[PDB]
Symmetry: C6
């Protein structure tokens, strides 16, 4: 990574090992995406490729990630056309999509783009593309849909809310659609007892009020 | 985090892993709140969101935390109205509530608000809101009330005090109300033997005197 | 903590985790007090409160510690009366007892008192009070008294000395009283064989001479 | 290693231990090669030889690695003929192939070549040769060929893709040949149900479309 | 500790934990003394007392260590008489024996004696006394004497040499006496087969020659 | 150790613990020698003696190591005769053999010889002697000879090569003799099937060609 006088560091064994263990244990659970970002703070494309390629197994998801990264690289290419000509002594060459992904750019070039003034944060751009692919994978590997989360007859409300917001965290929808799902399905798909209790509260009750209301049930 | 010449560091694997393990092991026990603060010392909103989002499961509590943070952000908004206009070259833009929570503010902007003179410690404000939500969760997940802690007939006084001050630590009440609870319930709800022994001591005996008095019982 | 150009650091996960594990494993054994001090070297009151509050369970002892700290704070208050008036631009405000314990003083104020010339080491004062309370707890949780340590008929002398100086380490008495206890009880409460062997040595034999004399027995 | 003011560090116990454990656990799986590179970032030839020689067992593969490194060293020799003569006071001696591999060059000489201006990155050259040998080993120890990966009658498509791209990751072929293998064999060697489903999609469907199409099957 | 611009550091959790585990696992085996020294490199008397007092159990040995340290302190006192008078502004006070052992000297005073020019390395003096006591303990807790190590009839020579030099490492004797013990007892107390084989070699054979000679036996 | 502005550090707990565990687990396997060197990079004689003396058990091998180091010290003595006279203010005293081994030289003197211009790297000289003794031990504790490694009738070629180059790694012979052993015994001592297959390849086939040729067998 690069940390602040900015200097370049090699990726630590604790970081890489921690990421490998995260993929081994949690597979592709939503919390993997924050952890990944946390473990890639200030990373060069070389460090990002290091983290991705250090994963054994799950090669279907890693190939999908490759294809997503390729799409984003092509979009960057058509959106940023490269200008032909010799680079000046005090200038950097324009990065291609494959240069953002650390495929066709050396570590020195990445340090150059990231640190030198008028910069291009290639590491955070690549990280953005990676996170897009990771969210697509998280969608694909979520078994349940939010529309099928229903409270059991004897299920405590709290556990049902845990399931609901886990599945909702796995759903691929904008925050307004998520807001609608909380607005409708949560109270809609509760068992009749808690459903009546919550319906009596009014359409503007917080989750704390709702959980306190049905905690005895 | 940011540590003192102030410099910005990435969050360490030991810190994040330690927090994840703390939530996995202790669930939402009161001691989680100090640990959290200890693990968030000098953190930017990005690090705080990193710690919160790295938690799998307990998504009901995490959603409640989101709603609490939203309330505090709205209060900050109405209390700090944003002034329209272009920001000067040597000035920072006024942070909104969503900027305090790291939702709508970049890492660079957070470094700017935290370090630059005439500062706004957005990390400690966000941390304050988070701790409010965490205390609400700790209340909700405490099964017992302080009014029901009663010493058993053969229960040693020391264990009863452990239960009493654990449950009391989970109670949501001001320090004066807590002082009243220690003043009344502790001696009130002991078994008749220790109750008589303590009643003989006088209304101004320390906990050490009380525990030494009933340690034989 | 603060370490030497003096700079302020956040408390490390290894330190806090190590302390939590120390309390979990050793409960309130005497060696906990050195370890604590070792883990609090150069700590601010915020770090000390962090270590104390990160302890789950043992809430009777933690409450006793709170009461001891309150007593010491009151003594500091009556011994150091606060002078009313506005603080000068280049001066610190006088710390109250609650400011020493990190209850009513910010981290910035603690850094100020500890680092600025003509200093007040509030961290080491608070640490002193904490250690007083910890010694009181160690007394209360010691089951045996030094007067009851007696060598068994077939017990090797070495194990009896281990028990004797463990219990003695738990005793609350000045070093002169401890010197008297070593002078009298150790030889007094040995089994008749080793008791005769030691009595033949003279009143001025070292522990090495005494243990070598009875190692065959 | 050497990290950026560039300074020379000794190899850390976490790095060497991590590499030894990687070879012990994963044998010669493809992900070993990225990890190795990650653990050798900025390494001198002494550190590379340290990592290679610290491996017990697998001595057939380590000998093959030695022979590959010898071939690359001979090629460097014939491609870079050494010029006879005394080295100037402010100049470095021309490195031989055995000097790149850390066999006949001191640590001081390696620091000299790597740091001094007009440099020769001997560590990354040696690392390149090592990675060539490692890829040859990875080929030799891959049991299956890509031409034999066939979906089972009841095998979910996702697992079949995992096998396919694992074996493909082990294959020694250019990226164009790999592109042809994905273009032909993946759809070719699926079971008739998924084979028909995929054939209906068209010759230009992404892996995400293909996996979503057959996830019910 | 203090490490080189010399600066004072707090003792690390890895060091203290490592020492505690060393005493827990190895009790008082000879290798404990090097480890201790390694873990106390550049330590102040506060760090040394920290390591010693962090040991639970073995309180007989720790008390013996206290008595040894007291003897050495008294010898330092009579050998270095303190001169009465006020200390100059740029001078240190003369350290007493109790000041060397960190009993009656603050951390600041220890830093002063150790760092300031014309220094007194109180940490290494205290460490020397501690190591004297530790060697006395190692003698006391060694069960066997070197005079009783005898090779079994079917015991391989190598194991007998392991026992011999372990027990010899535990013996309290000068290096000339140890040289005599190797010169006499090793060949003297071997079984008749190896005894004849070694006697044929001559009085000037190395341990390698001796072990190679009897490795078939 | 000493690391580059050169500064002296204390040996880390991870390094010493790692070495102790290496000896405990691998005994005296060849890979111990690289690891040792890796863990002693930039070490003073005090650190080397620290690593050697921290080893419990294996005291026959450690005594042999002592005797080897003594031989090398005597050779250094006769090869470097000490010149009598007083040392100048800006000069170092000539190191004896016992000074190289950290027996009769303080840490300060070792820092002096290693850092001061016109230096004598006493740490790397001592390390060289130690490695000589370690190689002698590795020879003595290798049970098999290279002349007895023979492929089984049903043994895969790859495992036989593993045994062959392990035993060969344990052999004490120059690289030309090793080259002859690979040239003759490897093909000589294979089973008749693989022996014929390899004999058909020609006297100039690489190990990769040989292993690929017999991998079906
Ligand atoms: Cl995995
Ligand atoms: Cl998954
Ligand atoms: Cl790869
Ligand atoms: Cl651009
Ligand atoms: Cl951009
Ligand atoms: Cl519930
Ligand atoms: Cl969890
Ligand atoms: Cl909970
Ligand atoms: Cl998230
Ligand atoms: Cl503001
Ligand atoms: Cl504010
Ligand atoms: Cl009790
Ligand atoms: Cl606990
Ligand atoms: Cl206890
Ligand atoms: Cl608290
Ligand atoms: Cl004051
Ligand atoms: Cl004071
Ligand atoms: Cl005994
Ligand atoms: Cl291995
Ligand atoms: Cl393999
Ligand atoms: Cl080697
Ligand atoms: Cl060149
Ligand atoms: Cl090149
Ligand atoms: Cl599937
Ligand atoms: Cl112990
Ligand atoms: Cl022992
Ligand atoms: Cl103590
Ligand atoms: Cl003196
Ligand atoms: Cl001295
Ligand atoms: Cl033998
Ligand atoms: Cl061992
Ligand atoms: Cl061995
Ligand atoms: Cl030793
Ligand atoms: Cl010399
Ligand atoms: Cl030399
Ligand atoms: Cl084979």
């Amino acid at each position: 990574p690069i940390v602040q006088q900015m200097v370049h560091q090699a990726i630590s064994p604790r970081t890489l090992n921690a990421w490998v263990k995260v993929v081994e244990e949690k597979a592709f659970s939503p919390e993997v995406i924050p952890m990944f970002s946390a473990l890639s703070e200030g990373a060069t494309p070389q460090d990002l490729n290091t983290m991705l390629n250090s994963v054994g197994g799950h090669q279907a998801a890693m190939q999908m990630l490759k294809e997503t990264i390729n799409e984003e690289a092509a979009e960057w290419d058509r959106l940023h056309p490269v200008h032909a000509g010799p680079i000046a002594p005090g200038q950097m060459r324009e990065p291609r999509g494959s240069d953002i992904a650390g495929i066709t750019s050396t570590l020195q070039e990445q340090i150059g783009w990231m640190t030198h003034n008028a910069p291009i944060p290639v590491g955070e751009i690549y990280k953005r593309w990676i996170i897009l692919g990771l969210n697509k994978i998280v969608r694909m590997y979520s078994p349940t849909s939010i529309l099928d989360i229903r409270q059991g007859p004897k299920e405590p409300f709290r556990d049902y809310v845990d399931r609901f917001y886990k599945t909702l965290r796995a759903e691929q929808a904008s925050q307004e659609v998520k807001n609608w799902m909380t607005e409708t399905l949560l109270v809609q798909n509760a068992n009749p007892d808690c459903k009546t209790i919550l319906k009596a509260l009014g359409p503007g009750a917080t989750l704390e009020e709702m959980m306190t209301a049905c905690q005895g049930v």
